[PDB]
Amino acid sequence: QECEQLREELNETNSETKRKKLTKRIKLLEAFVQSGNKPEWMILTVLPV
DNA sequence: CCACTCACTGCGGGGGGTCGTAAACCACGTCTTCAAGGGGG
């Protein structure tokens, strides 16, 4: 849903800096979607030794 | 309104008193095999 909203307002917006920021954000979101990693795994609950 | 910096950041060259357990044994002992010797040049 975040990707959908970002795509819509990217198609809507006219400012170029917003376009660059949102294309970076969309790249990150699609990377998470395709890779399979979960976002919450960046917070550690088990620490290896 | 988005232009146009500029400050910013990151990158290379202290007392005592009890308790339980893997150490920590000195007696414990009887077993082994230490065996004195035995005969066939």
Side-chain angles (χ1 to χ4, degrees):
Chain A
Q1 174 186 358
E2 189 91 18
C3 295
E4 306 298 341
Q5 275 153 350
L6 262 62
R7 270 194 267 271
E8 309 305 281
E9 191 277 332
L10 181 64
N11 285 26
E12 182 207 66
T13 191
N14 78 300
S15 183
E16 198 272 347
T17 80
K18 283 228 295 167
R19 283 143 170 172
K20 200 181 307 292
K21 192 58 58 193
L22 265 55
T23 199
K24 291 174 70 175
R25 270 218 52 191
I26 287 184
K27 287 309 159 293
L28 185 65
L29 295 167
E30 304 288 346
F32 278 100
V33 171
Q34 295 297 109
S35 72
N37 306 323
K38 292 179 183 58
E40 70 259 13
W41 295 351
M42 307 192 261
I43 314 289
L44 294 150
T45 57
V46 183
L47 196 75
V49 176

